[PDB]
Amino acid sequence: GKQLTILGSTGSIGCSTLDVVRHNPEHFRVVALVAGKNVTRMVEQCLEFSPRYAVMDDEASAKLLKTMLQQQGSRTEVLSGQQAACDMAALEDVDQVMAAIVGAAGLLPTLAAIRAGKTILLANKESLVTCGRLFMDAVKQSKAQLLPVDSEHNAIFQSLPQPIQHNLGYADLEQNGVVSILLTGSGGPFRETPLRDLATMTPDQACRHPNWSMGRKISVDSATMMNKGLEYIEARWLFNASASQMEVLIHPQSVIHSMVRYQDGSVLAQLGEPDMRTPIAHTMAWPNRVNSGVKPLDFCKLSALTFAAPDYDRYPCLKLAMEAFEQGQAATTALNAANEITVAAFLAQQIRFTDIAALNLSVLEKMDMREPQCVDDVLSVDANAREVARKEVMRLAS
Amino acid sequence: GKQLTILGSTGSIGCSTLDVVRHNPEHFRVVALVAGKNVTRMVEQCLEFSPRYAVMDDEASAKLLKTMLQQQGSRTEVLSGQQAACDMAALEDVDQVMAAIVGAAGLLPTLAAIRAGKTILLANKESLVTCGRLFMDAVKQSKAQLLPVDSEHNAIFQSLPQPIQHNLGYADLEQNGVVSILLTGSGGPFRETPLRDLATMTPDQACRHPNWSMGRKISVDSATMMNKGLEYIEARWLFNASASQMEVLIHPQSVIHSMVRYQDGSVLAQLGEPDMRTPIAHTMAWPNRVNSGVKPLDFCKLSALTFAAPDYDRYPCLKLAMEAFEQGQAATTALNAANEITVAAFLAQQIRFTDIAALNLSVLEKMDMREPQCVDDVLSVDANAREVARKEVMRLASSA
Ligand SMILES: NC(=O)C1=CN([C@@H]2O[C@H](COP(=O)(O)OP(=O)(O)OC[C@H]3O[C@@H](n4cnc5c(N)ncnc54)[C@H](OP(=O)(O)O)[C@@H]3O)[C@@H](O)[C@H]2O)C=CC1
Numbered sequence: 048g049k050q051l052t053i054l055g056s057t058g059s060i061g062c063s064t065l066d067v068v069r070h071n072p073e074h075f076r077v078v079a080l081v082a083g084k085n086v087t088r089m090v091e092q093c094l095e096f097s098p099r100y101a102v103m104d105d106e107a108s109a110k111l112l113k114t115m116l117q118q119q120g121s122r123t124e125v126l127s128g129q130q131a132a133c134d135m136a137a138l139e140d141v142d143q144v145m146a147a148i149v150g151a152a153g154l155l156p157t158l159a160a161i162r163a164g165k166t167i168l169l170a171n172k173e174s175l176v177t178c179g180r181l182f183m184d185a186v187k188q189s190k191a192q193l194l195p196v197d198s199e200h201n202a203i204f205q206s207l208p209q210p211i212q213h214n215l216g217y218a219d220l221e222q223n224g225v226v227s228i229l230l231t232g233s234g235g236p237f238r239e240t241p242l243r244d245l246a247t248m249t250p251d252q253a254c255r256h257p258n259w260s261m262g263r264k265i266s267v268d269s270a271t272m273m274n275k276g277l278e279y280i281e282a283r284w285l286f287n288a289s290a291s292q293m294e295v296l297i298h299p300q301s302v303i304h305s306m307v308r309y310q311d312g313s314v315l316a317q318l319g320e321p322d323m324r325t326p327i328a329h330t331m332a333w334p335n336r337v338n339s340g341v342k343p344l345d346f347c348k349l350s351a352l353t354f355a356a357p358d359y360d361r362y363p364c365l366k367l368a369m370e371a372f373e374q375g376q377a378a379t380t381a382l383n384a385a386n387e388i389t390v391a392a393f394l395a396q397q398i399r400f401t402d403i404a405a406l407n408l409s410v411l412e413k414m415d416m417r418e419p420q421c422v423d424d425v426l427s428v429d430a431n432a433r434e435v436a437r438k439e440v441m442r443l444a445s
Numbered sequence: 446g447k448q449l450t451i452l453g454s455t456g457s458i459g460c461s462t463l464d465v466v467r468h469n470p471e472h473f474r475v476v477a478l479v480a481g482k483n484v485t486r487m488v489e490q491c492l493e494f495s496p497r498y499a500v501m502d503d504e505a506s507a508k509l510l511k512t513m514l515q516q517q518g519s520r521t522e523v524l525s526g527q528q529a530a531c532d533m534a535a536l537e538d539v540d541q542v543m544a545a546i547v548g549a550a551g552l553l554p555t556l557a558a559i560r561a562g563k564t565i566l567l568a569n570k571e572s573l574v575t576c577g578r579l580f581m582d583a584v585k586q587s588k589a590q591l592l593p594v595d596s597e598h599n600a601i602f603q604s605l606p607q608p609i610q611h612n613l614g615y616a617d618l619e620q621n622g623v624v625s626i627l628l629t630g631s632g633g634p635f636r637e638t639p640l641r642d643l644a645t646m647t648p649d650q651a652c653r654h655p656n657w658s659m660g661r662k663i664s665v666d667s668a669t670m671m672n673k674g675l676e677y678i679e680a681r682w683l684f685n686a687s688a689s690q691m692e693v694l695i696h697p698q699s700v701i702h703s704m705v706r707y708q709d710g711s712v713l714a715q716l717g718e719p720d721m722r723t724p725i726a727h728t729m730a731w732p733n734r735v736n737s738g739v740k741p742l743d744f745c746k747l748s749a750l751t752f753a754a755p756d757y758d759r760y761p762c763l764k765l766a767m768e769a770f771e772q773g774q775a776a777t778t779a780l781n782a783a784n785e786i787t788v789a790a791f792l793a794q795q796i797r798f799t800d801i802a803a804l805n806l807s808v809l810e811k812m813d814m815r816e817p818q819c820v821d822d823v824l825s826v827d828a829n830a831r832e833v834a835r836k837e838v839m840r841l842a843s844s845a
């Protein structure tokens with residue numbers, strides 16, 4: 048049915064999307080797969096989904112993939128490099144592009160898909176956190192359909208009216224009866240720990256997700272709620288929402304994935320299991336649905352559902368991100384970059400848990416750079432913020 | 446500007462819907478108001494909204510109203526009788542019809558609107574509980590748009606995809622990725638009560654609705670869960686759902702009003718305040734939105750949200766309703782009727798709380814007439830079931 052190009056096929060999101068196509072072989076055809084260096088995984092994916100093209104970023108990995116596929120008898124054409132990755136995202140025949148490449152490396156490929164007016168299954172966070180302005184403008188000009196894959200943004204999308212779903216980003220919320228967007232989050236493992244003790248929390252304590260384990264980096268972001276701050280930035284761009292049209296709410300059980308408040312008092316919400324196949328399948332099948340392999344949510348086996356307002360004294364990173372948005376893309380990409388450095392430094396036990404927020408603010412207070420005007424400017428800000436951050440860490444550890 | 450006729454304007458749903466009109470005078474204009482005998486209320490509504498027509502089912506009430514509006518310089522023309530009520534629902538210029546007349550009455554006025562291809566703001570249980578097949582077949586023929594205002598059905602509607610909303614009753618769930626409809630209910634005040642004590646519960650105890658206070662009759666139906674049973678029958682007709690596509694869930698806090706499960710695992714739900722102005726406003730502005738005067742729900746002042754599966758030993762009436770549906774409109778009509786009689790008998794302390802489900806079942810078992818073909822047929826089944834019910838109550842409240 049629909050032809051897709053998967054950017055970052057060997058990662059977690061890429062594997063989950065391939066599982067969805069595996070559940071619906073007659074509705075989806077994989078024409079191109081793009082990854083980085085995981086040759087072993089790529090081979091298996093190429094051998095199962097018969098893509099016309101397979102692209103590795105690393106030139107060496109590509110050569111290795113090539114000999115592997117030939118030994119296995121596959122005729123999948125192998126390519127290498129960023130340009131090749133962008134070409135796959137712009138293939139004339141592809142309908143959808145699952146944008147799951149992490150970091151700055153996902154920027155150009157995602158943009159190429161946007162400029163080609165493809166339906167974009169957006170998973171890449173950096174896209175809007177650092178290039179929100181540039182990308183939403185690009186989506187408007189090409190008329191590409193953005194479909195948020197991230198759990199929260201996807202739930203919000205599903206809870207939004209039809210006119211906004213179509214023409215996403217440049218549609219008026221107020222004009223479609225939407226009062227605000229309710230962004231939910233678990234609050235992390237330190238939701239009730241004495242503020243006094245936050246400074247002594249260990250990486251292992253911080254990496255225990257209150258509901259289900261994830262990557263260490265993301266787990267820490269969930270403990271500081273920087274993750275929710277980043278999603279706040281994305282949501283603003285994605286749904287064309289002002290500050291007053293955004294509400295952040297702690298929901299410990301993570302059963303409700305996010306909601307939308309309406310003018311008549313109605314609140315629409317999306318609930319489900321903690322399985323990325325659900326959001327992914329929603330975007331791939333939109334406006335229809337398909338089986339994702341996810342089991343039906345059992346309402347009789349749930350913990351009581353609760354809510355609470357986030358305390359900025361406990362989650363300074365959340366407030367930091369909200370303020371950064373109002374300061375511009377330079378501030379948001381800098382915050383994002385600084386956080387990658389400080390979280391990494393926390394996990395490497397170079398700084399304390401509470402130093403993440405402190406150092407993130409310190410880096411931002413030293414930037415004072417102009418608004419990026421292109422992906423190159425963003426990259427420049429990113430590189431600059433990381434150096435400042437690495438220096439901040441080093442002076443702290445010494 | 447939307448032109449509307451309000452069937453049963455002086456009631457609770459009627460006043461709430463008129464309050465939505467106040468908040469949006471530039472979006473809605475009242476053309477006709479229909480009521481029964483509350484002349485006092487009608488006067489104020491007529492003076493405030495200046496309807497072109499006003500009608501009272503009661504001949505006398507209408508007479509009095511006609512003179513009061515005249516002496517108070519009102520241009521609204523007063524009519525009377527059911528025929529007039531039905532005409533108001535079919536006025537050519539009318540766009541929407543708030544079907545808020547309760548009981549057997551209102552069946553014909555709501556059908557009139559349906560046959561006229563109007564947009565029906567359905568706020569009347571009898572329509573689908575007793576005339577499910579008849580009304581749904583009729584909406585399919587005339588292409589009338591049904592918009593449920595009842596809290597649960599409205600929540601389900603808002604949580605359904607667009608293709609189903611625009612072809613309500615016609616479109617099928619599976620094709621649109623819907624696996625089931627989750628109908629939620631509070632469970633009543635006897636949710637935790639020891640099963641053996643139910644027989645000694647008094648009217649005052651059964652009439653304590655868990656969250657928001659309400660009518661005695663409906664409070665009792667909430668305690669036996671007959672209310673949810675009746676809603677189950679309506680939902681299957683309204684959303685074209687099979688038994689396996691229906692799920693009944695107890696949700697004590699009643700914050701979530703109902704939900705819908707999707708093929709990919711997604712569950713969509715509608716939450717809000719108990720205020721009926723929300724659902725009413727939703728249907729009136731659909732596919733758009735309008736301010737209803739209802740303040741946003743504060744998620745920080747909520748009780749923990751819980752869910753549970755209904756135990757049929759505790760809620761026999763829920764099960765009776767589900768079984769009645771498989772038997773047709775004759776059985777659902779008779780069940781509804783019997784329940785009116787038994788609940789009223791319970792309130793009058795002629796029978797025990799547990800005698801409601803017991804007698805409801807008993808009247809169903811004695812019913813013979815099968816599947817009505819027109820509303821007149823269901824009216825006949827209704828009348829017959831009421832009589833059988835009354836005799837069962839008298840037999841039990843004298844002999845047994
Ligand atoms: N994990 C989750 O639950 C969610 C993730 N997201 C976001 O969406 C994205 C999904 O990444 P995720 O799957 O989680 O994790 P991974 O980091 O494991 O996936 C990243 C993928 O991108 C590939 N890649 C890395 N660098 C390059 C490059 N330079 N050129 C081309 N491909 C490259 C990797 O290939 P290889 O491994 O072969 O090197 C891998 O397939 C992230 O940006 C994440 O923040 C959003 C919501 C949820």
Ligand SMILES: NC(=O)C1=CN([C@@H]2O[C@H](COP(=O)(O)OP(=O)(O)OC[C@H]3O[C@@H](n4cnc5c(N)ncnc54)[C@H](OP(=O)(O)O)[C@@H]3O)[C@@H](O)[C@H]2O)C=CC1
Pocket residue numbers: 452453454455456457458459479480481482483484501502530544545546547548550551568569570571594595596721
């Ligand atoms: N209450 C609620 O929250 C909800 C109710 N519903 C359903 O919708 C309907 C709404 O009734 P509700 O407003 O609650 O309560 P009421 O019984 O107070 O309202 C009924 C209305 O119908 C009028 N009426 C009664 N008999 C006749 C008749 N023979 N001819 C014309 N008009 C007549 C009444 O007029 P008058 O008083 O002047 O005689 C009154 O305006 C009910 O069937 C109910 O089951 C659905 C969802 C919610």
